[PDB]
Design a protein around this motif. Structure first.
Motif, PDB file in Angstrom:
ATOM      1  N   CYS A 140       0.820  -1.210   0.000  1.00  0.00           N
ATOM      2  CA  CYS A 140       0.000   0.000   0.000  1.00  0.00           C
ATOM      3  C   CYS A 140       0.854   1.261   0.000  1.00  0.00           C
ATOM      4  O   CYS A 140       2.045   1.211   0.313  1.00  0.00           O
ATOM      5  CB  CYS A 140      -0.905   0.014   1.231  1.00  0.00           C
ATOM      6  SG  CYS A 140       0.077   0.093   2.750  1.00  0.00           S
ATOM      7  N   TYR A 168       1.073   3.525   2.088  1.00  0.00           N
ATOM      8  CA  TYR A 168       1.708   3.690   3.394  1.00  0.00           C
ATOM      9  C   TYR A 168       3.090   3.036   3.375  1.00  0.00           C
ATOM     10  O   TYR A 168       4.079   3.625   3.827  1.00  0.00           O
ATOM     11  CB  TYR A 168       0.832   3.066   4.486  1.00  0.00           C
ATOM     12  CG  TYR A 168       1.492   2.972   5.841  1.00  0.00           C
ATOM     13  CD1 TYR A 168       1.448   4.036   6.738  1.00  0.00           C
ATOM     14  CD2 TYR A 168       2.168   1.813   6.223  1.00  0.00           C
ATOM     15  CE1 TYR A 168       2.064   3.948   7.986  1.00  0.00           C
ATOM     16  CE2 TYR A 168       2.788   1.714   7.464  1.00  0.00           C
ATOM     17  CZ  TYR A 168       2.733   2.782   8.338  1.00  0.00           C
ATOM     18  OH  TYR A 168       3.359   2.680   9.556  1.00  0.00           O
ATOM     19  N   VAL A 217      -3.462   0.771  15.176  1.00  0.00           N
ATOM     20  CA  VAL A 217      -2.225   0.012  15.327  1.00  0.00           C
ATOM     21  C   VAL A 217      -2.302  -1.075  14.259  1.00  0.00           C
ATOM     22  O   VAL A 217      -3.387  -1.451  13.826  1.00  0.00           O
ATOM     23  CB  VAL A 217      -2.078  -0.631  16.733  1.00  0.00           C
ATOM     24  CG1 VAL A 217      -3.122  -1.720  16.960  1.00  0.00           C
ATOM     25  CG2 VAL A 217      -0.679  -1.191  16.898  1.00  0.00           C
ATOM     26  N   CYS A 237      -0.492  -1.279  10.885  1.00  0.00           N
ATOM     27  CA  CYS A 237       0.456  -0.816   9.877  1.00  0.00           C
ATOM     28  C   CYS A 237       1.824  -0.610  10.501  1.00  0.00           C
ATOM     29  O   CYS A 237       2.817  -1.153  10.032  1.00  0.00           O
ATOM     30  CB  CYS A 237       0.003   0.513   9.292  1.00  0.00           C
ATOM     31  SG  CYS A 237      -1.687   0.425   8.785  1.00  0.00           S
ATOM     32  N   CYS A 268      -5.029   4.271   5.920  1.00  0.00           N
ATOM     33  CA  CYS A 268      -6.360   4.416   5.312  1.00  0.00           C
ATOM     34  C   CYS A 268      -7.347   5.361   5.995  1.00  0.00           C
ATOM     35  O   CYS A 268      -7.776   6.347   5.394  1.00  0.00           O
ATOM     36  CB  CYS A 268      -7.051   3.061   5.128  1.00  0.00           C
ATOM     37  SG  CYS A 268      -6.138   1.816   4.236  1.00  0.00           S
ATOM     38  N   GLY A 324      -3.104   3.875   2.576  1.00  0.00           N
ATOM     39  CA  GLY A 324      -3.007   2.597   1.889  1.00  0.00           C
ATOM     40  C   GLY A 324      -3.835   2.391   0.630  1.00  0.00           C
ATOM     41  O   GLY A 324      -3.342   1.823  -0.347  1.00  0.00           O
ATOM     42  N   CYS A 331      -3.586  -5.083  14.887  1.00  0.00           N
ATOM     43  CA  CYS A 331      -5.000  -4.881  14.584  1.00  0.00           C
ATOM     44  C   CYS A 331      -5.786  -6.179  14.382  1.00  0.00           C
ATOM     45  O   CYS A 331      -5.228  -7.218  14.005  1.00  0.00           O
ATOM     46  CB  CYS A 331      -5.156  -3.986  13.359  1.00  0.00           C
ATOM     47  SG  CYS A 331      -4.389  -4.795  11.967  1.00  0.00           S
ATOM     48  N   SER A 346      -8.128  -2.797   1.753  1.00  0.00           N
ATOM     49  CA  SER A 346      -6.853  -2.479   1.109  1.00  0.00           C
ATOM     50  C   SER A 346      -5.931  -3.696   1.084  1.00  0.00           C
ATOM     51  O   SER A 346      -5.743  -4.374   2.098  1.00  0.00           O
ATOM     52  CB  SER A 346      -6.147  -1.336   1.846  1.00  0.00           C
ATOM     53  OG  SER A 346      -6.946  -0.172   1.884  1.00  0.00           O
ATOM     54  N   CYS A 395      -2.733  -4.373   3.725  1.00  0.00           N
ATOM     55  CA  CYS A 395      -2.867  -5.108   4.971  1.00  0.00           C
ATOM     56  C   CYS A 395      -2.496  -6.560   4.796  1.00  0.00           C
ATOM     57  O   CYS A 395      -1.654  -7.076   5.523  1.00  0.00           O
ATOM     58  CB  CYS A 395      -4.303  -5.033   5.480  1.00  0.00           C
ATOM     59  SG  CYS A 395      -4.750  -3.359   5.838  1.00  0.00           S
ATOM     60  N   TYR A 451       1.020  -7.376   4.635  1.00  0.00           N
ATOM     61  CA  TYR A 451       1.567  -7.257   5.985  1.00  0.00           C
ATOM     62  C   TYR A 451       1.238  -8.456   6.867  1.00  0.00           C
ATOM     63  O   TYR A 451       2.100  -8.972   7.580  1.00  0.00           O
ATOM     64  CB  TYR A 451       1.043  -5.988   6.664  1.00  0.00           C
ATOM     65  CG  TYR A 451       1.830  -4.731   6.370  1.00  0.00           C
ATOM     66  CD1 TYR A 451       3.182  -4.791   6.028  1.00  0.00           C
ATOM     67  CD2 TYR A 451       1.233  -3.473   6.482  1.00  0.00           C
ATOM     68  CE1 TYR A 451       3.922  -3.626   5.810  1.00  0.00           C
ATOM     69  CE2 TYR A 451       1.963  -2.302   6.269  1.00  0.00           C
ATOM     70  CZ  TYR A 451       3.306  -2.386   5.936  1.00  0.00           C
ATOM     71  OH  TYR A 451       4.039  -1.238   5.759  1.00  0.00           O
ATOM     72  N   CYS A 461      -9.720  -1.289   8.243  1.00  0.00           N
ATOM     73  CA  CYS A 461     -10.319  -0.055   8.752  1.00  0.00           C
ATOM     74  C   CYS A 461     -11.042   0.698   7.641  1.00  0.00           C
ATOM     75  O   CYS A 461     -12.126   1.233   7.858  1.00  0.00           O
ATOM     76  CB  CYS A 461      -9.259   0.855   9.376  1.00  0.00           C
ATOM     77  SG  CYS A 461      -7.567   0.443   8.942  1.00  0.00           S
ATOM     78  N   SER A 510      -9.783  -2.340  12.466  1.00  0.00           N
ATOM     79  CA  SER A 510      -8.408  -2.235  12.955  1.00  0.00           C
ATOM     80  C   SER A 510      -8.362  -1.427  14.252  1.00  0.00           C
ATOM     81  O   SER A 510      -7.719  -1.818  15.222  1.00  0.00           O
ATOM     82  CB  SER A 510      -7.527  -1.530  11.907  1.00  0.00           C
ATOM     83  OG  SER A 510      -7.710  -1.851  10.520  1.00  0.00           O
TER      84      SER A 510
END
Ligand code: CFM
Ligand code: CLF
Ligand SMILES: [Ca+2]
Ligand SMILES: [Ca+2]
Lengths: 478, 522, 522
Positions: free
Chosen positions: A59, A61, A83, A85, A151, A182, B69, B91, B94, B97, B152, B187
């Protein structure tokens, strides 16, 4: 081998895709042909990733906090939003630095506004302000702050710009508001562009009126080198050895000061095109600072670059350049002399971000290896043009390769070694194919320059010819 | 330079004089870093009670959190079901990640998809993403079930997962009967464990809610077991071992032990064994349901008691002697299966290990963090060993949980100097280990930086980290370990005792100086 | 002084100024110790090749051996049989030593008796000691069987154990049918493992020799398994696990896993489960016999093949991937039981762990010691991981064994710089880790002093010890670990990798200086 066998492969894989997805994916799979310089060769990039196809993209970010802004040492970067990311991103990237973590350098840390429901509903714009104060109090030695939008921030529309400008003026600290939400964009790519613009507007201009910095005819700047595992340092040492003065490294062992100093450099050396070209162009059109691309992956490429770079200067530099090349010659020579035989003719497939997929090719060929296929996650056609002159005719090319695709491709191609990210590693190890992380160097030393080359070489051999590979199949089976 | 015969990687490399000198010049030339004095000063400052106080006065800034999250938990929960594919509506960033976060902890592949919502998908509301995403997902990765979670982004824009999924089916994007359980996982609410809770509850609703008519408690003669957010392969296995060891009919709901331990034999198994959909559909017919980690299975508890009508026992996470006893006895009562001499002996052995090591353990003060249940249990076991959990930190903890732990502490002399901390991040803990220095700290890999900090003050100030929890990224295969039951207890005990002895050996390794106490036998 | 609230034991205590000063005065006043310079000098000397050479020229002096006398093994072997009491005919001093030696390694009680021979018993030959000793032993500790071993004393004076025992029975001191197997175990021959071998062979003879008539190979459909000198509870258990996992009828001869792990429940069980006498008497009827540790079961091998007529397979100790495969396949062939998918998967997982950790392992040089089989196997596994066992030392090794290992080394590029050392003590090894410094050393607790020595030269010269073997006295419960099979392999692998990472974290813990490489993820 043969574009016909390859095109069949591409077309076979595409079969599982529902018509809509099939149509799109075909445009991102192509058989390389040098000389071709465009998208003409069935290759379109930098587009929306198909939903559900499990892509390996990130993303915006990640583009800002992850790769561009995070690396800055003496600066606190706030993962603004819930919290997650920040946590998942905390100390993931190996953008190495030199500092006392917690007092003057903060890379390792994860500063976040830990958004909670009430912050969304009412907008954590006040929370941010209060947060900043807490930061100044608890981390006096920070030379700046940066809010990295997650986001939520983009959606709820928090006036982070104002919070930054007001608090900044008050505290007399550089606070940079980055809109790297993101969802904005299609990958980490736009994140780069955004981060660059942020730098341009909030940091670069700071020292325009200042002329106190003593410049020299050899003041250069390394931009687009994130010092992954020490990459930047291993590159810097060479440049300086040939008489240059690296005023600043962009997002390596970088400090806000040297970033502000950058507009005083005589030349900008761009390593990672995809991430820094934006600011590079800005610095040119504005400060009139010329910029050139270069590659330090492998001796041939390194030497090529070293000369091309020295060529932009006078003879003292050029003469030194040769002394440098001469000095390191026996070394890299000894390296290939030892490792090449062990890796001679071994085929390799790659897939990385938006530079390495083409940049490391040289290094591979220096060890006698052949890259049968490669691709990027977020590269634009800019990169693809450059990629085609590097890939041997009929090698496979892919943009935003879906998990399923990479698997099937690998199944027929049957490379001796594969180089990709963490989300890939174990998948192919399971298959019995020697894998090597090309993002994090698989926790290994620098790959840039000559010193890095020795490491890169050792690593490839280490894995590719590891005894573990022969033991995949249990003797009681055939 | 480099010596081909003995290549030096980043570590020994940048220590070479030419490199050092380069950095020195770089620093002095363009970094403008604060003088070494100022640095040293501010550092010593960050260790004082004065600093710690200001540190605890924080109301906005969170530094080095000890949580993640919701969606992360939802995903892990998803991976526990047979041929199920985690799908996070939102998205794509995420998902990348999540995968990597788990990849690093398990050192295994982590399959998860996102319907990749972007700018216009957020503005216009990604219903299409859901449709295409689901169709594409099934067609490409051929999963039997898709577990929808959220980001989120999707939570802010109020994307009606249910509506979308329903329409996805009605419009022919996927077969109407294809299992697509969903769960809203903001999140910005709770944490990863809450995600696990929500995801599970949603799945439980999906295969139950409507079909509740033919269900009868106890008819299947099994005992449902919900592990919750568990990142130790050994923890799933030990429960299943004990249950089978007692001959107790059980059904572990959300069992990804297989997925997280695929054998490397030249073949890649995307999906692996897990909880069969039938086990989930039949779950209400179970005698009862035991929640291994009750503190983050709140929503599930209400659904089980409310809809399944199961009288869920008030049991603590089966950690340490007492709690494991209680767990076994409760299971024994519910299933009517007597605790086999097999387990009885195992309990006895752990006690024996405790008695053999009580000497070194008794008195050792610890600092710790992690998920509510894990921490709570770790504390209890620590108390049983005669140790003192002085700094109990649980970032994602709540008021009631704090009370629970406090009561547990008030039940033992060893808890006398303990202090539970909820909503506190590792930076807060950093201060605690500086001001009121404990002997060791038990936690995830994130604590390695606290140890780095502590040592930097001085050797006698160094507080060694004992890696137990999640995530553990700097140590290979610790995810195979166990913390639950007597087995987990034994491992933890051993680990602790040996950690103590290690540091002692180091402290007493100084020849002539401290080696006089370097005993061969301990 | 002492601060009641925070009492300081020997370690922090003698570091107090008044104490330090006292020692300084003591030293300078009446110790006449060599000047610190001379000490420092001679030390640096002991690390040179020059010293090492003289060190290796030793023909009489043995310093810090890596073995123990035969009787110790005989005793351990004895403890493996149901309600059997180890009886060492000779000086009582030995028995006290044996017991304690094992007490410290297992942290369990160690029952063993001596007939306490003294001055006149040696001169006149202790036949009475045998008579009374046996009678007293049975009457007092009520064992079902007594396994007689010996002390150098009894071996020098040629005390005919058999004659004594026979006369002990004939003269009514003990029932004529009471099982009293014996074995001559001269301290001054071979080592502890030889004792184990002799003791076992004697027991095997006792319940077999005469009754060989009704015996028929394979009739019992079991596979005899001889563990040999084994000091890891996990090693016995893993073999039994795998065998049961395959559904292979087996009979583990000499199984003290129970005796060495009695549960602490307010009751003391002197004797515990072990190999039943019937299993021993019926042993010849087995399909075949597998010797887990062939290199020290020589005498037993000859007796099994010669008398039992069992075609003992030429199998190496089941350590590491390859050898475990071979073991399983051989067992599979002999029993006709196909290797279950259970084990197949387990093998795959180990491979997976290898692949996940191959990066850090590849290239790491090690120094190691221990019993022949253990070492030999450890070497093979090390090679499989891509590590280099540069210094392979086995004090109690022999010419043929050296060759075997050499051949193994010559089979892999990684063995290129390895060197096998037989009849060499730890003082010899000390020199090897100084001159040709390896990364870590794998061995028993005795090596902790080598690490002490190494560190004293300098931090970069410190060679960390990885405790694997026997005996391990400075670490609680490591005796529960496993080294055999894929399970043992996995543990060893994990242990090694993590040991590497630990030292790295330490080396890179220096803030500002080396902490740049202090990665969260590895
Ligand atoms: S995947 Fe570089 S365009 Fe970017 S973190 Fe890696 S192939 Fe990035 S070279 Fe770079 S230091 Fe990178 S390895 Fe450009 S910065 S978004 Mo993942
Ligand atoms: S694509 Fe990127 S990582 Fe995703 S949200 Fe968007 S900026 Fe962030 Fe953050 S807390 Fe967790 S990981 Fe999200 S669900 Fe929100
Ligand atoms: Ca793996
Ligand atoms: Ca004990």
């Amino acid at each position: 081998m043969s574009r016909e066998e390859v095109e069949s492969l591409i077309q076979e894989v595409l079969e599982v895709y529902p018509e809509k997805a099939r149509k799109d994916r075909n445009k991102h799979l192509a058989v390389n042909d040098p000389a071709v310089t465009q998208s003409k060769k069935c290759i379109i990039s930098n587009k929306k990733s198909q939903p559900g196809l499990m892509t390996i993209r990130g993303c915006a970010y990640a583009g800002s906090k992850g790769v561009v802004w995070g690396p800055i040492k003496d600066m606190i970067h706030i993962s603004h939003g819930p919290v997650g990311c920040g946590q998942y991103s905390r100390a993931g990237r190996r953008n190495y630095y030199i500092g006392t973590t917690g007092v003057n350098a903060f890379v390792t840390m994860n500063f976040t506004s830990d958004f909670q429901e009430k912050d969304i509903v009412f907008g954590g714009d006040k929370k941010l302000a209060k947060l900043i104060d807490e930061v100044e109090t608890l981390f006096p030695l920070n030379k700046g702050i940066s809010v990295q939008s997650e986001c939520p921030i983009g959606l709820i529309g928090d006036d982070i710009e104002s919070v930054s400008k007001v608090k900044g003026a008050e505290l007399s600290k550089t606070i940079v508001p980055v809109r790297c939400e993101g969802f904005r964009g299609v990958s980490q790519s736009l994140g780069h562009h955004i981060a660059n613009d942020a730098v341009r507007d909030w940091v670069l201009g700071k020292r325009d009126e200042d002329t106190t910095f003593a410049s020299t005819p050899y003041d250069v700047a390394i931009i687009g080198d994130y010092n992954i595992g020490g990459d930047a340092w291993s590159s810097r040492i060479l440049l300086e050895e040939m008489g240059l003065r690296c005023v600043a490294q962009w997002s390596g062992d970088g400090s806000i000061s040297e970033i502000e100093l950058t507009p005083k450099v005589k030349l900008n050396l761009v390593h990672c095109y995809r991430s820094m070209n934006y600011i590079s162009r800005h610095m040119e059109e504005k400060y009139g600072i010329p910029w050139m691309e270069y590659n330090f992956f492998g001796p041939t490429k390194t030497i090529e670059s070293l000369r091309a770079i020295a060529a932009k200067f006078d003879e003292s530099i050029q003469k030194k350049c040769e002394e440098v090349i001469a000095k390191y010659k026996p070394e890299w020579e000894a390296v290939v002399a030892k490792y090449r035989p062990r890796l001679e003719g071994k085929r390799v497939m790659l897939y990385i971000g938006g530079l390495r997929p083409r940049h490391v090719i040289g290094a591979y060929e220096d060890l006698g290896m052949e890259v049968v296929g490669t691709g990027y996650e977020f590269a634009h056609n800019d990169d693809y043009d450059r990629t085609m002159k590097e890939m041997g005719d009929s090698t496979l090319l892919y943009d935003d390769v879906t998990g399923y695709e990479f698997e099937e491709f690998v199944k027929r191609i049957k490379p001796d070694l594969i180089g990709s990210g963490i989300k890939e590693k174990f998948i192919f190890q399971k298959m019995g194919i020697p894998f090597r992380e090309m993002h994090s160097w698989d926790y290994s030393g620098p790959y840039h320059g000559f010193d890095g080359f020795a490491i890169f070489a050792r690593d490839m051999d280490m894995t590719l010819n590891n005894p573990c590979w022969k033991k995949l199949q249990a003797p009681w089976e055939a | 330079s480099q010596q081909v015969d003995k290549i030096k990687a980043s570590y020994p490399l940048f220590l070479d004089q030419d490199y050092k000198d380069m950095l020195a010049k770089k620093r002095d030339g363009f970094e403008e870093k604060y003088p070494q004095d100022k640095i040293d000063e501010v550092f010593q400052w960050t260790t004082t009670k004065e600093y710690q106080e200001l540190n605890f006065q924080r109301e906005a800034l969170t530094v080095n959190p000890a949580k993640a999250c919701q969606p992360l938990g939802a995903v892990l929960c998803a991976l526990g079901f047979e041929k199920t594919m985690p799908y996070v509506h939102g998205s794509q960033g995420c998902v990348a990640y999540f995968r990597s976060y788990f990849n690093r902890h398990f050192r295994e592949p982590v399959s998860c998809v996102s319907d990749s919502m972007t700018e216009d998908a957020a503005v216009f509301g990604g219903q299409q993403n859901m449709k295409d995403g689901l169709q594409n997902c099934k067609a490409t990765y051929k999963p039997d079930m898709i577990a929808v979670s959220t980001t989120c982004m999707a939570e802010v824009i109020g994307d009606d997962l249910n509506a979308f999924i329903n329409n996805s089916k009605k419009e022919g994007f996927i077969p109407d009967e294809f299992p697509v359980p969903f769960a809203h996982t903001p999140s910005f609410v709770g944490s990863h464990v809450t995600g696990w809770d929500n995801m599970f509850e949603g799945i439980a609703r999906y295969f139950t809610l409507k079909s509740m008519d033919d269900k009868v408690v106890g008819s299947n003669k099994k005992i449902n077991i919900v592990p919750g957010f568990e990142t130790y392969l050994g923890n799933f296995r030990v429960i299943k071992r004990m249950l089978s060891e007692m001959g107790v009919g059980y059904s572990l709901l959300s069992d990804p032990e297989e997925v997280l331990d695929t054998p490397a034999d030249g073949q890649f198994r995307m999906y692996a064994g897990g909880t069969t959909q039938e086990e989930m559909k039949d779950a209400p017919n179970a005698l009862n349901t035991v929640l291994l980690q009750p503190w983050h299975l709140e929503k599930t508890k209400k659904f089980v008691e409310g809809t399944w009508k199961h009288e869920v026992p008030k049991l603590n996470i089966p950690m340490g002697l007492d709690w494991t006893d209680e767990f076994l006895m409760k299971v024994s009562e519910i299933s009517g299966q007597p605790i086999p001499a097999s387990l009885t002996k195992e309990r006895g052995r752990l006690v024996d290990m405790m008695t053999d090591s009580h000497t070194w353990l008794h008195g050792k003060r610890f600092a710790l963090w992690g998920d509510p249940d894990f921490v709570m249990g770790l504390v209890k076991f620590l108390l049983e060993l005669g140790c003192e959990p002085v700094h109990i930190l649980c970032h994602n903890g709540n008021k009631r949980w704090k009370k629970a732990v406090d009561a547990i502490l008030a039940a033992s002399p060893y808890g006398k100097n303990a202090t539970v901390y909820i909503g506190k991040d590792l930076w807060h803990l950093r201060s605690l280990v500086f001001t009121d220095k404990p002997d060791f700290m038990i936690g995830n890999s994130y604590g390695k930086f606290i140890q780095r900090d502590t040592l930097h003050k001085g050797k006698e100030f160094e507080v060694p980290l004992i890696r137990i929890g999640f995530p553990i990224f700097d140590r290979h295969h610790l995810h195979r370990s166990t913390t639950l039951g007597y087995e987990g207890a034994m491992q933890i005990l051993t680990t602790l005792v040996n950690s103590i002895l290690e540091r002692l050996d180091e402290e007493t390794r100084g020849m002539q100086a401290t080696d006089y106490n370097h005993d061969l036998v301990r």
